[PDB]
């Protein structure tokens, strides 16, 4: 399959992501490394991702998430749940069981199987921050481990977040690597130390 762009693009509205500072304790379930631009999270646990803009986008703007393989030798392969997890009957009533990325707690989430690339994505309406908040947060879930045999099978992935108009045209783009693993805090510490030693 052709490869969706991963180029960072703030666009007219100054679109970019933000992440909490969750630390690296052994018990943490989701933690983001700015040094690696990499999110580490446990299977099916809440991943808060912030959306920031410098100016207000139009009504009907949407926010799409899609996963691709990071390594060039795998980027053309569709990222999907493994043969076990696609059959484990953990449906939330909305997400197709094949989709790796879900949006949690948003009844307006829509799930796309692209008729040409076969790639999966989940899209929600863009919403302004709640009163008293400075940004909007989407809660994502990743529904397979990076290690799942027959699926990601240890290959690193990226999540691409696109801000879109009501037709699906590009308004902004950002991205981050993801590792879905049992101990995100330890793995973040290990990978950050590996980077320093490099
Ligand atoms: C990207 C999320 N988002 C924001 C994130 C951060 C800030 C800055 N706060 C300091 C403002 C907005 C904002 C304003 C309007 C809208 C929308 C308007 C119509 C549909 S969404 C979305 C918005
Ligand atoms: Zn799996």
From Swiss-Prot:
Protein name (database record): Cellular tumor antigen p53
Residues binding Zn(2+), per UniProt: 82, 85, 144, 148
Phenotype upon changing residue 24 to R: In a sporadic cancer; somatic mutation
Outcome after substituting residue 108 to L: In sporadic cancers; somatic mutation
Lineage of source species: Eukaryota, Metazoa, Chordata, Craniata, Vertebrata
Organism: Homo sapiens (Human)
Consequence the record notes for mutating residue 160 to S: In sporadic cancers; somatic mutation
Listed result of changing residue 192 to V: In sporadic cancers; somatic mutation
Part of the whole protein covered: 95 to 292 of 393
Effect the entry attributes to changing residue 140 to H: In sporadic cancers; somatic mutation
Effect noted on mutating residue 54 to N: In sporadic cancers; somatic mutation
